[PDB]
Write a protein that binds this ligand. Structure first.
Ligand code: FES
Length: 106
């Protein structure tokens, strides 16, 4: 029960990494050590916005609940639209199965 993911970069933008349904925090990327130019700016615990990165709106948009409370760190994550969503505290999912993550560039 594993799930694949795609990581966007700058050179060829189109990384990737195999994950497991139920992964832990600050996982996946690091799990493989993907480029992830930044690798958990804060180191997690919420503080940065370069963790989850852009998330297929078909995954994020599928959430009718988000406010100053939910955001916490987001708020106006330079680049955030309707797909990205800071996590660094969420386990993998079937939705992310073959998802393309893109850093907002910070
Ligand atoms: S690494 Fe900084 S909030 Fe996730």
């Amino acid at each position: 029960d594993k799930i694949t993911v795609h990581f966007i970069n700058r050179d060829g933008e189109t990384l990737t990494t195999k994950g497991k349904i139920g992964d832990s925090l600050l996982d996946v990327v690091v799990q493989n050590n993907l480029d992830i130019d930044g690798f958990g700016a804060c180191e997690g615990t919420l503080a940065c916005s370069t963790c989850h990165l852009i998330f297929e709106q078909h995954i994020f948009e599928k959430l009718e609940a988000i406010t100053d409370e939910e955001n916490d760190m987001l708020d106006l994550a330079y680049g955030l639209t309707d797909r990205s969503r800071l996590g660094c505290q969420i386990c993998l999912t079937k939705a992310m199965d073959n998802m393309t993550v893109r850093v907002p560039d910070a």
